[PDB]
mmCIF file of C-alpha atoms and ligand atoms in Angstrom:
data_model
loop_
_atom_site.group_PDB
_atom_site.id
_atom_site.type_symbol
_atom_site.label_atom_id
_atom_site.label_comp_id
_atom_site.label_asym_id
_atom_site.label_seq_id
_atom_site.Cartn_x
_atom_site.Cartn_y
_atom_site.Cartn_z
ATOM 1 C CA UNK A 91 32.877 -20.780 -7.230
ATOM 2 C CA UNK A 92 36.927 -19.967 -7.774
ATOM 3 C CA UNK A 93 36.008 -17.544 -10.619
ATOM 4 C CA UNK A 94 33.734 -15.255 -8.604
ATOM 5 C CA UNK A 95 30.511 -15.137 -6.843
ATOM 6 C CA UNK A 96 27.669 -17.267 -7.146
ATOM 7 C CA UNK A 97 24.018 -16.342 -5.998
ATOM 8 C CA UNK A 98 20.132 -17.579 -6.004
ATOM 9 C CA UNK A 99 17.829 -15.061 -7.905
ATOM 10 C CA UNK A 100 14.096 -15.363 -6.629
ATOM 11 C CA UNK A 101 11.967 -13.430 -8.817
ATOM 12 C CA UNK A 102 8.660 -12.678 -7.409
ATOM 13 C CA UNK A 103 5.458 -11.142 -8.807
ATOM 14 C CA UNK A 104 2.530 -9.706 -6.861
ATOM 15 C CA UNK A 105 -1.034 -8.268 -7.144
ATOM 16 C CA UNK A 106 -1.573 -5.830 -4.106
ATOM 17 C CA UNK A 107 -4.732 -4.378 -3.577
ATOM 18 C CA UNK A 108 -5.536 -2.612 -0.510
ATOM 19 C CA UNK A 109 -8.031 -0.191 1.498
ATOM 20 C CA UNK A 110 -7.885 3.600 1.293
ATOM 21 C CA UNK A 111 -7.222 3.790 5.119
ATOM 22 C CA UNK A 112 -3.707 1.633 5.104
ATOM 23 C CA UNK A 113 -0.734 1.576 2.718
ATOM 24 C CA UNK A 114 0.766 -1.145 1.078
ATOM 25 C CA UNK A 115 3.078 -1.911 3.849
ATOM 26 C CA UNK A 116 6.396 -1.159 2.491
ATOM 27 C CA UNK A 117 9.337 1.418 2.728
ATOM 28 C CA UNK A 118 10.815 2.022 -0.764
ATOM 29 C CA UNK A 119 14.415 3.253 -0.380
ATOM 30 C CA UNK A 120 16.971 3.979 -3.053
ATOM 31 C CA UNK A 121 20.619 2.001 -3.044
ATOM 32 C CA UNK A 122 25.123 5.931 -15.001
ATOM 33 C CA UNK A 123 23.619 2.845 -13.105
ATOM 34 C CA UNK A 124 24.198 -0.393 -14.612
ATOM 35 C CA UNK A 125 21.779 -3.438 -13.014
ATOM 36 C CA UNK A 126 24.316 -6.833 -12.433
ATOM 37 C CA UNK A 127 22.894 -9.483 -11.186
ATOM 38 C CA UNK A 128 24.011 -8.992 -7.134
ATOM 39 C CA UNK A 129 22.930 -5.351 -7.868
ATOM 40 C CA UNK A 130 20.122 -5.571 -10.084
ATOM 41 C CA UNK A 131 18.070 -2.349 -9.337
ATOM 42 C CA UNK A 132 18.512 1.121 -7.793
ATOM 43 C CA UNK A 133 15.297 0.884 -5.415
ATOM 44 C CA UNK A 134 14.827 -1.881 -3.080
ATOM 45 C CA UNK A 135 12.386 -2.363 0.146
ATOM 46 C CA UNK A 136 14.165 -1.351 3.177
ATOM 47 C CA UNK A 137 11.413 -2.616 5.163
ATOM 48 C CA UNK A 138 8.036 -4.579 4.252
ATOM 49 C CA UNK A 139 5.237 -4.493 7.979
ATOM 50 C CA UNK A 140 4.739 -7.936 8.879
ATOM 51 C CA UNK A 141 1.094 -9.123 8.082
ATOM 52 C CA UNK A 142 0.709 -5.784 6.207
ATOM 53 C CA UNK A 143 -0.885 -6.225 2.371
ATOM 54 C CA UNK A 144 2.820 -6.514 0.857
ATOM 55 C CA UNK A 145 3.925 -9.258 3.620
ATOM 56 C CA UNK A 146 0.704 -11.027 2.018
ATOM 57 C CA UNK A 147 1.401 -11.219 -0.754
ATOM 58 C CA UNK A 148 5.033 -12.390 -0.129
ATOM 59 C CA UNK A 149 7.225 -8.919 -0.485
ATOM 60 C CA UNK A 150 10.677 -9.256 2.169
ATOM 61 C CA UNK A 151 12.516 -6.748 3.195
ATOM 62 C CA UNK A 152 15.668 -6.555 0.938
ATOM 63 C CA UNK A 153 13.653 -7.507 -2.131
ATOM 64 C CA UNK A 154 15.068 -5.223 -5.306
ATOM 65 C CA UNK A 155 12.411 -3.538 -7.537
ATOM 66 C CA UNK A 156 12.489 -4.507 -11.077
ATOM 67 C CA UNK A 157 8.510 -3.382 -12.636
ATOM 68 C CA UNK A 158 5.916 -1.009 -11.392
ATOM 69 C CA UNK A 159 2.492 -1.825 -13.142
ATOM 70 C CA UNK A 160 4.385 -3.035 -16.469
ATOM 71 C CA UNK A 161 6.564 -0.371 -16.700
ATOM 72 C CA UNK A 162 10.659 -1.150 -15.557
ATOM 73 C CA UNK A 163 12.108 0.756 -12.941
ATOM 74 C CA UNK A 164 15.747 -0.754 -12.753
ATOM 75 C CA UNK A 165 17.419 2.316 -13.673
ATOM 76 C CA UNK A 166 14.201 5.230 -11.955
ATOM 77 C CA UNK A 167 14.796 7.064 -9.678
ATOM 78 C CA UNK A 168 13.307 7.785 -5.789
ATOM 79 C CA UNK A 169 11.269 9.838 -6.406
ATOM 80 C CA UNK A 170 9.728 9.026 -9.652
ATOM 81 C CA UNK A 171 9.361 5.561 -8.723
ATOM 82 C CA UNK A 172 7.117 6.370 -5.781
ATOM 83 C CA UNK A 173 5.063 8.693 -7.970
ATOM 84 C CA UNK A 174 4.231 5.618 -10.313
ATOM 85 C CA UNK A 175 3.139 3.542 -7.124
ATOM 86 C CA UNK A 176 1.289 6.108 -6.073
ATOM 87 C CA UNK A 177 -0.510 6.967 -10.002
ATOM 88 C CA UNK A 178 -2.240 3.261 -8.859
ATOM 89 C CA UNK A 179 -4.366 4.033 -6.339
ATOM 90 C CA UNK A 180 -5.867 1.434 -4.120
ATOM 91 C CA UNK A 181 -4.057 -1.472 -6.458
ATOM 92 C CA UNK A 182 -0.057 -2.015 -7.115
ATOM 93 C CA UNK A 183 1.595 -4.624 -9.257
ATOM 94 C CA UNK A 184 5.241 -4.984 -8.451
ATOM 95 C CA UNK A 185 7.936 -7.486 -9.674
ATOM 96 C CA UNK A 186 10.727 -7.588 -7.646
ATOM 97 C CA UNK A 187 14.192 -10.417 -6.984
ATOM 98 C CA UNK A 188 15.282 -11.440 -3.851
ATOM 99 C CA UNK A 189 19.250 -12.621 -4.095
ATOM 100 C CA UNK A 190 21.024 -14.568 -1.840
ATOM 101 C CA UNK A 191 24.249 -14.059 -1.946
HETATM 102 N N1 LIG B 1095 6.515 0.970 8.196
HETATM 103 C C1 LIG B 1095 5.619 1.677 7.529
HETATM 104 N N2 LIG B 1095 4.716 1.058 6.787
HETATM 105 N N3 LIG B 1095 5.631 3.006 7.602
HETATM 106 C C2 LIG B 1095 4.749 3.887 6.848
HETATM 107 C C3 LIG B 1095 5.026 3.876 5.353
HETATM 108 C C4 LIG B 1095 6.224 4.720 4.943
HETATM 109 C C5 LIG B 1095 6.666 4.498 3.496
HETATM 110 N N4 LIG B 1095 7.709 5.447 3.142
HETATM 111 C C6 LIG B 1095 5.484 4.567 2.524
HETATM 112 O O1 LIG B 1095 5.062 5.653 2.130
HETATM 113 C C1 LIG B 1096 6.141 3.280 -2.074
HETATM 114 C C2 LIG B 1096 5.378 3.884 -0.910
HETATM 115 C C3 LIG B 1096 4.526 5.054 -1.379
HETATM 116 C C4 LIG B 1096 4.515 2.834 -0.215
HETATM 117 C C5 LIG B 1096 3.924 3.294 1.120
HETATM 118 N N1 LIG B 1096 4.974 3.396 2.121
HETATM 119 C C6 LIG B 1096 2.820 2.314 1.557
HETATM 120 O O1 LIG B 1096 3.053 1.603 2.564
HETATM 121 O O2 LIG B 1096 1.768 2.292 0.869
#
């Protein structure tokens, strides 16, 4: 509108559960931090491998990453973030919001 920028916020949650011999099919890559709403978290999917378990399940590449099995990750960083995916094993449950902007 005249008074500033408008956008579409998508959230999406998923249940991924894969195989020992693939991953989830995503590259996790990171943009004090304050979340707006164009901005809303510090990790986002760079890329997502079409057909892969996240494509599935309906990840996109330039979804934002809000929860990591219940816990929020708006404001975690690269590192630690990955670690939590990774304390899940074979099974991942993400929330994430795709803007349009
Ligand atoms: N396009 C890919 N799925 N590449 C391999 C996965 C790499 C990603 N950083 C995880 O771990
Ligand atoms: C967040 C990352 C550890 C995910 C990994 N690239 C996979 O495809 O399983």
């Amino acid at each position: 509108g005249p008074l500033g920028s408008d956008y579409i916020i998508k959230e999406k949650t998923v249940l991924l559960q894969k195989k020992d011999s693939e991953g989830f099919g995503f590259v996790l890559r990171g943009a004090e931090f304050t979340p707006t709403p164009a901005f809303p978290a510090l990790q986002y999917l760079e890329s997502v491998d079409e057909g892969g378990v996240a494509w599935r399940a309906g990840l996109r590449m330039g979804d934002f990453l809000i929860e990591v099995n219940g816990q929020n990750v708006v404001k975690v960083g690269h590192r630690q973030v990955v670690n939590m995916i990774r304390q899940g094993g074979n099974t991942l449950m993400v929330k994430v919001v795709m803007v349009t902007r």
